[PDB]
Amino acid sequence: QVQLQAASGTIFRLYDMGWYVASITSGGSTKYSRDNAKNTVYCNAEYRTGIWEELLDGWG
Amino acid sequence: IYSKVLVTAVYLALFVVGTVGNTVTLFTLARSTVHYHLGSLALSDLLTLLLAMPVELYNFIWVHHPWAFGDAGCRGYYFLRDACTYATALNVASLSVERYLAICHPFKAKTLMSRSRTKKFISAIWLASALLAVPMLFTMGEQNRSAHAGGLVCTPTIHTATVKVVIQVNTFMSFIFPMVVISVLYTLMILRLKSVRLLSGSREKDRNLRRITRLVLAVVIAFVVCWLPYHVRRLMFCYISWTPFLYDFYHYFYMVTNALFYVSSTINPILYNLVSANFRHIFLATL
Numbered sequence: 175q176v177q178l179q180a181a182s183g184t185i186f187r188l189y190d191m192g193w194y195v196a197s198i199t200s201g202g203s204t205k206y207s208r209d210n211a212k213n214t215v216y217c218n219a220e221y222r223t224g225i226w227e228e229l230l231d232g233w234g
Numbered sequence: 235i236y237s238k239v240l241v242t243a244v245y246l247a248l249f250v251v252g253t254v255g256n257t258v259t260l261f262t263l264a265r266s267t268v269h270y271h272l273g274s275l276a277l278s279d280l281l282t283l284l285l286a287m288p289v290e291l292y293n294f295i296w297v298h299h300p301w302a303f304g305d306a307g308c309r310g311y312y313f314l315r316d317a318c319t320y321a322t323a324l325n326v327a328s329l330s331v332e333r334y335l336a337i338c339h340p341f342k343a344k345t346l347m348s349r350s351r352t353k354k355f356i357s358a359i360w361l362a363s364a365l366l367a368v369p370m371l372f373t374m375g376e377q378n379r380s381a382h383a384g385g386l387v388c389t390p391t392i393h394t395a396t397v398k399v400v401i402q403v404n405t406f407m408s409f410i411f412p413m414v415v416i417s418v419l420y421t422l423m424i425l426r427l428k429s430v431r432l433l434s435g436s437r438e439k440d441r442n443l444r445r446i447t448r449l450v451l452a453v454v455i456a457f458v459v460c461w462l463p464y465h466v467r468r469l470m471f472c473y474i475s476w477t478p479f480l481y482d483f484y485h486y487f488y489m490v491t492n493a494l495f496y497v498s499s500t501i502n503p504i505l506y507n508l509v510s511a512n513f514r515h516i517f518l519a520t521l
């Protein structure tokens with residue numbers, strides 16, 4: 175369901191997004207810029223599709 | 235008569251499904267901390283289906299008068315229904331306690347819930363349930379009723395005002411208090427679940443925890459649906475002292491609440507197979 179372009183689809187929550195070089199987390203802690211509200215940051219993103227589901231990472 | 239066959243067929247269907255399912259659940263679980271609580275629930279259900287229902291069918295649905303089980307049986311039957319009522323609610327609240335400790339205090343839980351301490355906490359629950367059901371022993375008896383043909387009946391043997399106190403106290407201890415604790419602990423868990431990225435520090439153990447917590451929450455919702463109407467009926471006896479419409483509404487509400495008492499004893503095994511793939515395979519293997 176998750177699609178990588180910014181991310182859109184059906185996502186309950188997005189967690190760790192980074193350039194695959196640097197990574198950014200929900201809240202902004204970073205290691206080597208993020209807009210948390212916009213759902214925008216190879217790009218790889220950690221996500222969950224429901225409250226009861228397992229953690230997954232998808233590539234773009 | 236037509237109503238009697240209709241009610242009797244619904245009870246027989248529940249008895250077959252409930253008996254086989256809870257009996258399998260015991261062996262299936264047999265061959266860890268979660269396992270004991272689900273085992274204890276299966277046992278409360280088996281007593282309800284094997285002892286309470288046969289008395290209800292004979293001396294309530296088919297033969298209204300006279301009572302045939304003697305004075306002792308009259309006292310024993312009401313005592314059993316209360317004892318089962320307490321055991322079920324206490325198990326669901328304690329099962330809710332085990333899930334909460336796993337999510338919000340993982341390291342502390344390991345010692346707090348240990349297999350030896352789990353066996354002891356379940357024993358206390360059964361002992362407590364029987365003690366809470368002792369008052370109904372004294373409230374009910376067998377009396378010879380003169381001249382409604384006269385004869386032996388199972389009826390309350392104390393003042394009707396005092397009887398109301400006994401019913402209200404049971405409602406608070408068996409339903410209201412459990413619901414308040416269960417509501418608070420589940421609210422807390424969901425707030426943690428919606429925030430944390432990983433629980434227990436691995437993906438596999440995180441996925442396992444979320445699936446088990448979801449299963450227990452389904453147990454809770456089924457409990458609220460079956461038991462809350464039953465307490466409302468009991469509360470009508472205390473506070474609702476009629477036309478043809480109102481009479482019929484009260485008659486049917488009473489029969490519906492009676493069927494729900496048995497439905498509660500049969501729902502769990504069905505829920506386990508639907509929610510969990512692993513239980514289904516072992517259960518299907520054992521069954």
Ligand SMILES: COc1cccc(OC)c1-c1cc(C(=O)N[C@]2(C(=O)O)[C@@H]3C[C@H]4C[C@H](C[C@@H]2C4)C3)nn1-c1ccnc2cc(Cl)ccc12
Pocket residue numbers: 390397401467468470471472474475481482484485486487488
């Ligand atoms: C005044 O009571 C009600 C008024 C309106 C609706 C009612 O039930 C749907 C009730 C009600 C509750 C109980 C009700 O729960 N008795 C008990 C029971 O479980 O059998 C009896 C009496 C005590 C001790 C023990 C356990 C409790 C409470 C045996 N019984 N009961 C009824 C009493 C009298 N007439 C009724 C007529 C109709 Cl059409 C429907 C219900 C009636």
Ligand code: NA
Pocket residue numbers: 275276277278279322499
């Ligand atoms: Na039960």
